Amino acid sequence: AKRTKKVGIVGKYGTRYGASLRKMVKKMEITQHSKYTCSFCGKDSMKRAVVGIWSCKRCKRTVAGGAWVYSTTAAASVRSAVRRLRETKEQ
């Protein structure tokens, strides 16, 4: 059945710490230690080690990224920001 009714994965940490502090770790741990499509290994084998340090478990590529998702939307924007700008200096 729908086991809990709202909280999901923070349900370990119940009746504690407050209302909208039980919620703020929900929105930041339904992403963390879920599995991601690897940009290189192609499969879905992404777990964490510590803050911002992901590795695969298959084909052993390890990539530094965001710290609660695989890479933040702050990050690829920069990876897009230096992308368009690089063709402007030497050309």
Partner: protein, 152 residues
């Protein structure tokens, strides 16, 4: 353990000796292992290479900024921030920069930095939530107290 940030383990072949020489950077964003880094004034801009300020225009972001050219990067490397430069000046080789303070100050230009945002953020937005994790948050950073107020 003692950071929040991740490091970066990398090595080089010496222009002068015969051996490999191992160093440790601060992690630029997107650093997969097996990435081919580059370190030079002629090294073209791509994240996360390391290049001096005189060969990149304004509008780029960097990390591991050096103030004094030779002292190898003592500015703005910690988790979830980004070294910026918004000013070039060809008069006496000057480039103004904005630190993550917001107070924007002046550095010289021949110094080096690593292009891109630096990995780790944001470890203020997950509340540590108990008095056992923020024991271990100060297990190995310093030994403050779990601090004790004044008025008792």
């Amino acid at each position: 353990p003692g950071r929040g940030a991740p490091l970066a383990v990398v090595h080089f072949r010496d222009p002068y000796r015969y051996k490999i020489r191992k160093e440790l950077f601060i992690a630029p964003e997107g650093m997969h292992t097996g990435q081919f880094v580059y370190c030079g004034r002629k090294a073209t801009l791509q994240i996360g290479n390391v290049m001096p300020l005189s060969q990149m225009p304004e509008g780029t972001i960097i990390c591991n900024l050096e103030e004094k050219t030779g002292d190898r990067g003592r500015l703005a490397r910690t988790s979830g921030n980004y070294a910026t430069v918004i000013a070039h000046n060809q008069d006496t080789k000057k480039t103004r920069v904005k630190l993550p303070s917001g107070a924007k100050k002046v550095v010289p230009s021949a110094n080096r930095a690593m292009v891109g945002i630096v990995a780790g953020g944001g470890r203020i937005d997950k509340p540590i939530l108990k008095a056992g994790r923020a024991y271990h948050k100060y297990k190995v950073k310093r030994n403050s107290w779990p601090k004790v107020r004044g008025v008792a």
